[PDB]
PDB file of C-alpha atoms and ligand atoms in Angstrom:
ATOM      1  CA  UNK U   1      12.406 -14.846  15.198  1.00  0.00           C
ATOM      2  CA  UNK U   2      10.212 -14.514  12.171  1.00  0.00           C
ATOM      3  CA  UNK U   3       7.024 -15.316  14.680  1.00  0.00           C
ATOM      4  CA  UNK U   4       4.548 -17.759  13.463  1.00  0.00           C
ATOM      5  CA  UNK U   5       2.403 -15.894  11.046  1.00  0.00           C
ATOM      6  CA  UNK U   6       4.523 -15.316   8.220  1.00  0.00           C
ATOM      7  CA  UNK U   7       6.476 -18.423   9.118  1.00  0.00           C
ATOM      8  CA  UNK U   8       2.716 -19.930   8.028  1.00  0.00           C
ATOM      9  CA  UNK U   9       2.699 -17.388   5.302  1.00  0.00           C
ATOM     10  CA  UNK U  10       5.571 -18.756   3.641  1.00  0.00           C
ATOM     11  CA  UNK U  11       4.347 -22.513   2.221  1.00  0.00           C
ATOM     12  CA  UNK U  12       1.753 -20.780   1.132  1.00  0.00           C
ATOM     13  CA  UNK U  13      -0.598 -20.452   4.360  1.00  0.00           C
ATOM     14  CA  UNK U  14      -2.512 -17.403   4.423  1.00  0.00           C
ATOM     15  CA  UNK U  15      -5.112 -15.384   6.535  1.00  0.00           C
ATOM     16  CA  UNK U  16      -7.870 -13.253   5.401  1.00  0.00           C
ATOM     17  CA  UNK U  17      -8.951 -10.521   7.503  1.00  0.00           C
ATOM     18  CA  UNK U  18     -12.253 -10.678   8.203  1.00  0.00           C
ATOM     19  CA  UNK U  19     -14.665  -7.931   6.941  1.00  0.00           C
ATOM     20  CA  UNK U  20     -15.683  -6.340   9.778  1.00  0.00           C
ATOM     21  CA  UNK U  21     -12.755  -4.484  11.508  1.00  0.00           C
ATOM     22  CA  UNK U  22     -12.582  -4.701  15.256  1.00  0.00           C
ATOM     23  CA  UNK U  23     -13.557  -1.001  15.543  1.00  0.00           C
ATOM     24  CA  UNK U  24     -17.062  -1.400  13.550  1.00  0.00           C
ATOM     25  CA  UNK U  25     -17.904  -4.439  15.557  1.00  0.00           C
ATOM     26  CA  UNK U  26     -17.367  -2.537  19.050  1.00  0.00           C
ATOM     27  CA  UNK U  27     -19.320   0.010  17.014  1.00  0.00           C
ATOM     28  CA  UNK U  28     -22.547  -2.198  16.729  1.00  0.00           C
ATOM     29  CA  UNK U  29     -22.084  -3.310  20.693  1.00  0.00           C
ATOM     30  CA  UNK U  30     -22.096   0.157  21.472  1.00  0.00           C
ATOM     31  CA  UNK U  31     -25.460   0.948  19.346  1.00  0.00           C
ATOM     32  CA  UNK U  32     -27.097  -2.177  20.958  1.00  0.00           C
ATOM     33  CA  UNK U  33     -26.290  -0.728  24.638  1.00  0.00           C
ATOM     34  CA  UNK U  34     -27.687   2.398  24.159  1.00  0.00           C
ATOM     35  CA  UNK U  35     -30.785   0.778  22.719  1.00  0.00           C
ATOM     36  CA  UNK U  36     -31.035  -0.971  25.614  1.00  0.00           C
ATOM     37  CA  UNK U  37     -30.569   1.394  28.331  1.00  0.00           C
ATOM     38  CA  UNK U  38     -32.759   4.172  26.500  1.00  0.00           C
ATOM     39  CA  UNK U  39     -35.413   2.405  24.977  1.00  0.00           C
ATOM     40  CA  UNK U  40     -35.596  -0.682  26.528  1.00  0.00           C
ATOM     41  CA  UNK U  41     -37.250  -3.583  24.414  1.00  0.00           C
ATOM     42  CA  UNK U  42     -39.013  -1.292  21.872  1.00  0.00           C
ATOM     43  CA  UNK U  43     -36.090  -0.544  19.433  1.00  0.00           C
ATOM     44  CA  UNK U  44     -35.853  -4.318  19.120  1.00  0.00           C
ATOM     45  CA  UNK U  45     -39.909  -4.540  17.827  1.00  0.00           C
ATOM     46  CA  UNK U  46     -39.955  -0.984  16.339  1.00  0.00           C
ATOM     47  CA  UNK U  47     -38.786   2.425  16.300  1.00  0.00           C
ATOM     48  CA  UNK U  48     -37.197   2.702  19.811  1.00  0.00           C
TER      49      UNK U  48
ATOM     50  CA  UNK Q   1     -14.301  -7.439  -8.765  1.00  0.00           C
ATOM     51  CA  UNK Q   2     -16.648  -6.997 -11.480  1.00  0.00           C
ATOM     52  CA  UNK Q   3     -20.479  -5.002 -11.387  1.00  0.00           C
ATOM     53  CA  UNK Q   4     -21.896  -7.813 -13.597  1.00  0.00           C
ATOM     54  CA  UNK Q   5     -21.343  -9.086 -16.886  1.00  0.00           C
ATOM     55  CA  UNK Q   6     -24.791  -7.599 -17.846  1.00  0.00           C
ATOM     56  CA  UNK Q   7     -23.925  -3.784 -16.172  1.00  0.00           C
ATOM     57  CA  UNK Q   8     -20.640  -3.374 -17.781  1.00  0.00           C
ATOM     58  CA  UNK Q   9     -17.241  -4.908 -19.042  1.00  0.00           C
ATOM     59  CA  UNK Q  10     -15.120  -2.866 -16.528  1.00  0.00           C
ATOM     60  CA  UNK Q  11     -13.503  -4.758 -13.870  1.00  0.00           C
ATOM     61  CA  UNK Q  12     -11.492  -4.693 -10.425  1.00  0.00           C
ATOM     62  CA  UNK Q  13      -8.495  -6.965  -9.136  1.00  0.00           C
ATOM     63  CA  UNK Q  14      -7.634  -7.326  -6.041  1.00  0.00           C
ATOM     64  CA  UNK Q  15      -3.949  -8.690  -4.902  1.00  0.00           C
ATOM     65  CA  UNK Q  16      -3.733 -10.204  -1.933  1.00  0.00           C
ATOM     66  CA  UNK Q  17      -1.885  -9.729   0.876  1.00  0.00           C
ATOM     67  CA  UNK Q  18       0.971  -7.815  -0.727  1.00  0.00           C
ATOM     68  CA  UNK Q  19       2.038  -3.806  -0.690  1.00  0.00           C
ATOM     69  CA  UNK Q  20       0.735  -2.275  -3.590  1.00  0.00           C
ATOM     70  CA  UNK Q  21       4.360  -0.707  -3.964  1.00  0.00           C
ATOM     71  CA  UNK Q  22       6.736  -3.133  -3.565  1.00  0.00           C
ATOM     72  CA  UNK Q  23       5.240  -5.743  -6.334  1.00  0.00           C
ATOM     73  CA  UNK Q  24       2.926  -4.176  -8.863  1.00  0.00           C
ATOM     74  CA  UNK Q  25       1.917  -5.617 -11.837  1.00  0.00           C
ATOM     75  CA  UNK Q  26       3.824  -2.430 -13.267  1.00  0.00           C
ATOM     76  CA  UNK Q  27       7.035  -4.072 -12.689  1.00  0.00           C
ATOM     77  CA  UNK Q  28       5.364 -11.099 -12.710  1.00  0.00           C
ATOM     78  CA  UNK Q  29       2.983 -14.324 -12.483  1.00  0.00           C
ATOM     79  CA  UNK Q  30      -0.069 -13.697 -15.370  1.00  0.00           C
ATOM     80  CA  UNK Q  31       1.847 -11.040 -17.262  1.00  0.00           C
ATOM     81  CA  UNK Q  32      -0.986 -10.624 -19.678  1.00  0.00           C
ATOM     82  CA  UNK Q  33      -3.483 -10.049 -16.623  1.00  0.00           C
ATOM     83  CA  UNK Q  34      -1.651  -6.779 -16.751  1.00  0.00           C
ATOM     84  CA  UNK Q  35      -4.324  -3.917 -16.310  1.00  0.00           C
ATOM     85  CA  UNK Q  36      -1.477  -1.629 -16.850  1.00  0.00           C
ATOM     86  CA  UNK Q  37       0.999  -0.245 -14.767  1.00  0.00           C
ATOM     87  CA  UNK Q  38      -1.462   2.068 -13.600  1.00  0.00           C
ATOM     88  CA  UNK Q  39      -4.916   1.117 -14.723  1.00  0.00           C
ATOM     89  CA  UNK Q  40      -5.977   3.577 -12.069  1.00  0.00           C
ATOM     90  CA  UNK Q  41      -5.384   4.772  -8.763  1.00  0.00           C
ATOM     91  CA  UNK Q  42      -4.086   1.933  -6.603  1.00  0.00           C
ATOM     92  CA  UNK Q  43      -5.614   1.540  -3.438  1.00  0.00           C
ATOM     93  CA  UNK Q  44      -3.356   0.026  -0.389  1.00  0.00           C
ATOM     94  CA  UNK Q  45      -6.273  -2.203   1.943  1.00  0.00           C
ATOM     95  CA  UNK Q  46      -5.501  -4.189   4.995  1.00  0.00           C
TER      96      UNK Q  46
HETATM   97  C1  NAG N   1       4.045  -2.335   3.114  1.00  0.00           C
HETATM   98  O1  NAG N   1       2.689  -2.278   3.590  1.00  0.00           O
HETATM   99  C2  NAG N   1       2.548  -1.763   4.920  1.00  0.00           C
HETATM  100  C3  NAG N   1       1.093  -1.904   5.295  1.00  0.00           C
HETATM  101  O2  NAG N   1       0.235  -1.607   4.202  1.00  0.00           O
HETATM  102  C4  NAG N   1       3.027  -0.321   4.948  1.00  0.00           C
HETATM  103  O3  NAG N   1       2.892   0.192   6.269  1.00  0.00           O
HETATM  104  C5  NAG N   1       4.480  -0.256   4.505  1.00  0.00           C
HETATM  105  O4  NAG N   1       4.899   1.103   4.458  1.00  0.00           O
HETATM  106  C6  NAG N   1       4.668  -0.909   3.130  1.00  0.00           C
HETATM  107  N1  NAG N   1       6.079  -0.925   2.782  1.00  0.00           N
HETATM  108  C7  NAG N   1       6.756   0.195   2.486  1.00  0.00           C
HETATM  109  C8  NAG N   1       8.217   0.033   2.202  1.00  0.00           C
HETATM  110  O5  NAG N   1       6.210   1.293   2.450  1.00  0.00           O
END
């Protein structure tokens, strides 16, 4: 069926992964929840 | 990929979207861009 992506990749239509990988970006949501929940608004200003 | 001009002469290249296996520069569009057939490890990114 050949999809759609490499159907675009042929004529010379190409897609460049972006730099952050899904995994790292759930990462920083993660790190911003437990600043949240633990510290509040003072890890935002400061040390938390 | 290249430190600086300044910092040093050594360089890295980076082919896109394409197995490092399959088509090498070891086995070609810019032939005398060669950097060998290994210039040094090859790395296999997403
Ligand atoms: C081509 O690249 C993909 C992803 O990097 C890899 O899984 C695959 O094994 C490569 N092709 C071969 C024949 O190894």
């Amino acid at each position: 069926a050949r999809d759609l992506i490499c159907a675009q990749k042929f004529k010379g239509l190409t897609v460049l992964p972006p730099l952050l990988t899904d995994e790292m970006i759930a990462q920083y949501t993660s790190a911003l929840l437990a600043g949240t929940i633990t510290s509040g608004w003072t890890f935002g200003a400061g040390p938390a | 990929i290249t430190p600086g001009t300044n910092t040093s002469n050594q360089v890295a290249v980076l082919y896109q979207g394409v197995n490092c296996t399959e088509v090498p520069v070891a086995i070609q569009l810019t032939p005398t861009w060669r950097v060998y057939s290994t210039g040094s490890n090859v790395f296999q990114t997403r």
